[PDB]
Give the backbone structure.
Amino acid sequence: SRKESYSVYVYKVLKQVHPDTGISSKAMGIMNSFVNDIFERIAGEASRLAHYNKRSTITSREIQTAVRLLLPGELAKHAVSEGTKAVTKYTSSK
Amino acid sequence: SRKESYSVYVYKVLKQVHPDTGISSKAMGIMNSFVNDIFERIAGEASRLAHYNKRSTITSREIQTAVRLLLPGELAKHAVSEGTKAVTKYTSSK
Amino acid sequence: KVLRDNIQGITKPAIRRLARRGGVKRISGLIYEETRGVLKVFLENVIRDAVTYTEHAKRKTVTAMDVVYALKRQGRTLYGFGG
Amino acid sequence: KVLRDNIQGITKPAIRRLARRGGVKRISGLIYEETRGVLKVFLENVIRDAVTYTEHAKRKTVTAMDVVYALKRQGRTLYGFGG
Amino acid sequence: KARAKAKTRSSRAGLQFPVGRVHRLLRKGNYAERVGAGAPVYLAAVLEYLTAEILELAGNAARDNKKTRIIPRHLQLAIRNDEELNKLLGKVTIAQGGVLPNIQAVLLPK
Amino acid sequence: HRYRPGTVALREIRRYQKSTELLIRKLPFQRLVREIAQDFKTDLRFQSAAIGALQEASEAYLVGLFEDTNLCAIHAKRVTIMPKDIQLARRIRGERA
Amino acid sequence: HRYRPGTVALREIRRYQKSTELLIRKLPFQRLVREIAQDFKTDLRFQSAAIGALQEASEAYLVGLFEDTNLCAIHAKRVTIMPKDIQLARRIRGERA
DNA sequence: GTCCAGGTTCTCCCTGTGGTGAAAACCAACTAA
Ligand SMILES: [Mg+2]
C-alpha cells in the first residue's frame, strides 16, 4: 500500500545548497531514517515535557525546549533561530 | 495536595516475606522510585510495542513481551509466571 | 535446522581484516579464540532481543525493522534499514 | 552571584577519597588537574539540560525532579529523589 | 460550489518539509492530546535545517572525491568529520560506511 | 610503628567501600553549580534535594570513572593511575568527543 | 624485494580504511545466526536485509572494539594487541557483566 | 642514489541506479457553526 516517507522532501533540500548533486537510493534511506529518528526524539521529548508540566498540549514552545535538549552546543543556537523564522513568517501569513 | 505513591503497597509486600522487619523513610523512596521507573520502562516499551504493530491497544500480551525484554535471564522466567497466575486467578473471578 | 561448527566460520583472515579496519598493525594468534567469544556474546544479546519482537507479533520471519528495534534497545542505533 | 576558584573546591584528599572508593591504591599527582576537568564536563551537560526544564515551566528554582529528569535524558538514572 | 485556492502550510512558512504530514504525526503518535498549530511548523523547520547540514557536508565530500551522487560513504564521512554533528550521532552506526581513515602514528614503519 | 607504603592505603579501600557517607562536601560542591548555572541563566534558585541529586550523581561518575581508570593502570603493568589513563578511559566509552 | 615486518601491514591499514566492502563473508556469517536462533525458537526464517542488518552491525562492533583495543596495546608500550586487552577493553565500557 | 613492486590515473565499454514524468490515492485545507 502506501509507505509515507521524507524522501521527496530531501530533493527539495538537496537542490537548495548543492544544485548539481544527486543522491543514491541507499543513502536516501539514511536521510529518511535520520528524519524519523530525529523526529521522535524531539516529539518524544516534547511528549514527556507535556506530562512533566501537567498539560495535554504540545505547543510550539515545547518543541523549542525539546531541541535545546537534544542538539548540543552550536546546533542548538541555529536550529532554534532556524525555526522562529519559519514561525514568524508563518503567522504573519494566513 | 495529593502525591500518589507506592509506599503503602510496600508494607503489604514487606510484611509478606519478612514480617518482623521495618523499613526506613529514605529507603522507602528508593523502593518508591524503583517502582515508578520500572513502571515506565515496561509501559514505555509496551507503548512503543503498540506503534510497531499498528494497534492502539495495550493488551495483557504486550506487557508480557515488555517484561521479557527488560528483565534478564532468570527474572524473565519468574516474573512472567508470577503474572499469569495473577491473571488466571483474576479472570476466573468476577 | 542445525548447522554446527559455524562460530568457526569467522575465519582467520576475516578477523585480521577487521583488525586492520580498526587501525591495528600486529596481532596475536590468541585473539581468534577471543573474538569468536565476544562475537557470540553480542549475537546472544540481539537475537534474544529480536525474536521476542517477532514472536510478539506472531510472525515467523524476523524482519529488517526487528533487528533495528533490538539495536535500538541496547543503545547502538543502526540507520539505513529503516526504524 | 559570582564565586570563582571553586573548581579548586574539589580538594586534593576528596579526589583521593573518591579514588579509594573505586578500588585504587596508588595515584599520580596529575589526576587532580584531570578530574576537575572531567567533572566540569559532566556538570556542563546536566545543568545545561536541567535549566531548560526549569526555564520551560518558568520556575526560578531548579527543583529535585528537574535534575533527575536531566539524568533521565543522558541514560544515567538516579533513584531516591523521585522521578 | 467551489472554494478558494488551497495554499499549503509548507508554502506559507517558507519551508520544504511538510507541516500537514508532521501535524498528523503528533496526533497519531500519542505524544500528547493537544498539538498546537505552530508546533509542526516549528518542527518541520528543525527537520529542515538538519537535513541541509548533513547534505551540505555530504555535497562537499562527493565533490572532493569527484562524484555526482552522494553514496552512503559520504554520509558516513560527512558525519564524524564535523565535530558537533558527531556528538549528536555519537552512538549511531551508519550502514555501509566503514570508518574514517585513522592511524595512531605509533604504528608507522621502522 | 612505621607503616610501609601501601598499608595505610589499603586500609582506606576497605574503609570507603563500606560507608555511604558524602565524600565531596556540600558547600564546596554547591558553589561549583553556582559557576556553571550562571552562564545559561543568571539568578536561579536550587532546591537542596537537587544539589544533592548532583552530589550523588557526580560522585556516581568519578567512582565509575576511577574504577574504570584503575583497570588501565593495572593493565600497563603498573599500580599507579596517570592522566593518560583517564583520557583514554573516556575515549573508550565515548564520554568525550 | 623482501618487505620488512610492518610494511605490508601498514599497506592494509590504509587499504581497508578506504573501502566499504564486506569483510566477514555472507554465508559463513549467515550460518552463525542459524546457531543462536535455534535456541530461542526453532524453524525461523530470515529476510536477507535482516542478516545484512547484522553483518553491518557485528562488523560495527568489532571495529569499534579493536580500535578501542589498540588504544590499550599502545598504552602498555606495545604495538601488539593481546586477549588481556580486549577483556579489559570491555570491562571499561560495561559491555560484559 | 637505484630498481622494482603495487598503486594511481586515464580511457573505453558496459550496467545499474537515479531522477523524472504520469496517474492514483489520500490528506490537508477550507468552509459554516
Ligand atoms: Mg448552527
Summary: The domain at 1-94 of chain A is CATH 1.10.20.10 (Histone, subunit A). The longest helix of chain A spans residues 25-52. Residues 8 and 85 of chain A are 23 Å apart (CA to CA). Residues 2, 11, 22-25, 28 of chain A lie near DNA strand H (CB under 10 Å from a C1').
